[PDB]
Protein backbone atom coordinates (compact mmCIF):
# COMPACT_ATOMS: atom_id res chain seq x y z
CA UNK A 1 0.00 0.00 0.00
CA UNK A 2 1.62 3.20 1.23
CA UNK A 3 5.14 2.54 2.50
CA UNK A 4 6.22 6.17 2.89
CA UNK A 5 5.38 5.81 6.57
CA UNK A 6 8.56 3.76 6.57
CA UNK A 7 10.64 6.63 5.23
CA UNK A 8 9.40 9.08 7.85
CA UNK A 9 9.48 6.34 10.48
CA UNK A 10 13.01 5.08 9.83
CA UNK A 11 13.98 8.73 9.47
CA UNK A 12 12.51 9.87 12.77
CA UNK A 13 14.28 6.93 14.43
CA UNK A 14 17.74 7.67 13.02
CA UNK A 15 17.46 11.39 13.73
CA UNK A 16 16.90 10.53 17.40
CA UNK A 17 19.39 7.72 18.12
CA UNK A 18 21.98 10.17 16.74
CA UNK A 19 21.29 13.51 18.44
CA UNK B 1 -4.44 -8.83 26.54
CA UNK B 2 -2.69 -6.75 29.20
CA UNK B 3 -0.24 -5.36 26.67
CA UNK B 4 -3.24 -4.48 24.51
CA UNK B 5 -5.21 -2.74 27.28
CA UNK B 6 -2.28 -0.52 28.23
CA UNK B 7 -1.39 0.15 24.61
CA UNK B 8 -4.98 1.11 23.78
CA UNK B 9 -5.27 3.44 26.77
CA UNK B 10 -2.04 5.23 25.90
CA UNK B 11 -3.02 5.49 22.25
CA UNK B 12 -6.70 6.35 22.75
CA UNK B 13 -5.81 9.10 25.21
CA UNK B 14 -3.25 10.60 22.82
CA UNK B 15 -5.57 10.60 19.80
CA UNK B 16 -8.48 11.89 21.91
CA UNK B 17 -6.29 14.57 23.51
CA UNK B 18 -5.04 15.81 20.14
CA UNK B 19 -8.72 16.21 19.23
CA UNK B 20 -9.03 19.86 20.23
CA UNK B 21 -9.00 19.24 23.97
CA UNK B 22 -6.85 17.59 26.66
CA UNK B 23 -4.34 2.61 35.60
CA UNK B 24 -0.55 2.39 35.33
CA UNK B 25 2.75 4.13 36.02
CA UNK B 26 4.67 3.39 32.82
CA UNK B 27 1.52 4.54 31.04
CA UNK B 28 2.24 7.90 32.67
CA UNK B 29 5.72 8.53 31.26
CA UNK B 30 4.66 6.89 28.00
CA UNK B 31 1.91 9.41 27.28
CA UNK B 32 4.29 12.27 28.06
CA UNK B 33 6.98 10.75 25.87
CA UNK B 34 4.35 10.29 23.18
CA UNK B 35 3.28 13.92 23.60
CA UNK B 36 6.78 15.29 23.02
CA UNK B 37 7.89 13.02 20.16
CA UNK B 38 4.44 12.75 18.59
CA UNK B 39 3.82 16.47 18.27
CA UNK B 40 7.29 16.83 16.80
CA UNK B 41 6.70 14.32 14.02
CA UNK B 42 3.47 16.01 12.91
CA UNK B 43 5.07 19.45 12.73
CA UNK B 44 8.16 18.06 11.00
CA UNK B 45 6.02 16.38 8.34
CA UNK B 46 2.83 18.45 8.25
CA UNK B 47 3.05 18.35 4.45
CA UNK B 48 4.25 14.79 3.90
CA UNK B 49 1.40 13.62 6.13
CA UNK B 50 -1.17 15.72 4.29
CA UNK B 51 0.02 14.08 1.09
CA UNK B 52 -0.82 10.68 2.54
CA UNK B 53 -4.16 11.82 3.93
CA UNK B 54 -5.13 13.09 0.46
CA UNK B 55 -4.05 10.11 -1.66
CA UNK B 56 -5.82 7.96 0.94
CA UNK B 57 -8.91 10.13 1.37
CA UNK B 58 -10.95 9.60 4.53
CA UNK B 59 -14.66 10.27 4.97
CA UNK B 60 -16.21 7.29 6.79
CA UNK B 61 -15.31 4.29 8.96
CA UNK B 62 -15.00 2.14 5.84
CA UNK B 63 -11.93 4.25 5.06
CA UNK B 64 -10.54 3.92 8.57
CA UNK B 65 -10.66 0.12 8.33
CA UNK B 66 -8.71 0.30 5.07
CA UNK B 67 -5.98 2.47 6.56
CA UNK B 68 -5.51 -0.51 8.87
CA UNK B 69 -4.25 -2.76 6.08
CA UNK B 70 -1.90 0.06 5.06
CA UNK B 71 -0.33 0.29 8.51
CA UNK B 72 0.05 -3.48 8.76
CA UNK B 73 2.13 -3.30 5.58
CA UNK B 74 4.41 -0.68 7.13
CA UNK B 75 6.32 -3.49 8.83
CA UNK B 76 6.51 -5.59 5.65
CA UNK B 77 10.17 -4.83 4.92
CA UNK B 78 10.80 -6.84 8.08
CA UNK B 79 12.06 -3.63 9.66
CA UNK B 80 10.59 -2.69 13.03
CA UNK B 81 11.67 0.21 15.23
CA UNK B 82 10.43 2.93 17.56
CA UNK B 83 10.60 5.51 14.79
CA UNK B 84 7.98 3.58 12.82
CA UNK B 85 5.85 2.81 15.87
CA UNK B 86 5.61 6.44 16.95
CA UNK B 87 5.19 7.67 13.36
CA UNK B 88 2.16 5.43 12.98
CA UNK B 89 0.64 6.79 16.18
CA UNK B 90 1.54 10.30 15.03
CA UNK B 91 -0.21 9.83 11.69
CA UNK B 92 -3.14 8.54 13.73
CA UNK B 93 -3.35 11.74 15.75
CA UNK B 94 -3.11 13.57 12.43
CA UNK B 95 -5.90 11.47 10.93
CA UNK B 96 -7.90 11.98 14.14
CA UNK B 97 -7.78 15.75 13.64
CA UNK B 98 -9.13 15.50 10.10
CA UNK B 99 -11.66 13.10 11.59
CA UNK B 100 -13.34 15.68 13.82
CA UNK B 101 -12.98 18.46 11.24
CA UNK B 102 -15.67 16.42 9.52
CA UNK B 103 -17.62 15.79 12.72
CA UNK B 104 -16.79 12.07 12.71
CA UNK B 105 -15.19 12.06 16.16
CA UNK B 106 -16.88 8.66 16.53
CA UNK B 107 -14.30 7.13 14.17
CA UNK B 108 -11.42 8.11 16.46
CA UNK B 109 -11.58 5.24 18.96
CA UNK B 110 -11.96 2.66 16.17
CA UNK B 111 -8.84 4.26 14.73
CA UNK B 112 -7.10 4.00 18.10
CA UNK B 113 -8.22 0.39 18.44
CA UNK B 114 -7.02 -0.21 14.88
CA UNK B 115 -3.58 1.26 15.53
CA UNK B 116 -3.23 -0.82 18.69
CA UNK B 117 -4.14 -4.02 16.83
CA UNK B 118 -1.08 -3.63 14.61
CA UNK B 119 1.36 -3.03 17.45
CA UNK B 120 -0.01 -5.55 19.93
CA UNK B 121 -1.43 -8.32 17.76
CA UNK B 122 1.01 -8.28 14.84
CA UNK B 123 4.11 -6.99 16.63
CA UNK B 124 3.74 -8.43 20.13
CA UNK B 125 7.05 -10.27 19.69
CA UNK B 126 9.19 -7.20 18.97
CA UNK B 127 7.09 -5.12 21.36
CA UNK B 128 7.41 -7.56 24.26
CA UNK B 129 11.11 -8.12 23.55
CA UNK B 130 11.70 -4.35 23.51
CA UNK B 131 10.54 -3.85 27.11
CA UNK B 132 7.08 -2.73 25.96
CA UNK B 133 6.21 0.88 26.77
CA UNK B 134 9.13 1.12 29.20
CA UNK B 135 11.47 0.55 26.27
CA UNK B 136 9.54 3.21 24.37
CA UNK B 137 10.03 5.67 27.24
CA UNK B 138 13.69 4.68 27.59
CA UNK B 139 14.49 4.85 23.88
CA UNK B 140 13.11 8.36 23.38
CA UNK B 141 15.09 9.58 26.38
Curated annotation (Swiss-Prot), chain B:
Keyword Transmembrane helix attributed: yes
Keyword Cell membrane listed: no
Secretion signal, residue range per the UniProt entry: none
GO cellular component, one term: mitochondrial outer membrane
Annotated phenotype, changing residue 29 to R: No effect on ubiquitination
Quaternary structure note: Interacts with HIF3A (via C-terminus domain). Interacts with BAD, BOK, BIK and BMF. Interacts with PMAIP1. Interacts with BBC3. Isoform 1 interacts with BAX, BAK1 and TPT1. Heterodimer of isoform 1 and isoform 2. Homodimers of isoform 1 or isoform 2 are not detected. Isoform 2 does not interact with pro-apoptotic BCL2-related proteins. Interacts with RTL10/BOP. Interacts with BCL2L11; may sequester BCL2L11 to prevent its pro-apoptotic activity. Interacts with GIMAP5 and HSPA8/HSC70; the interaction between HSPA8 and MCL1 is impaired in the absence of GIMAP5.
Protein name, UniProt field: Induced myeloid leukemia cell differentiation protein Mcl-1
Gene field: MCL1
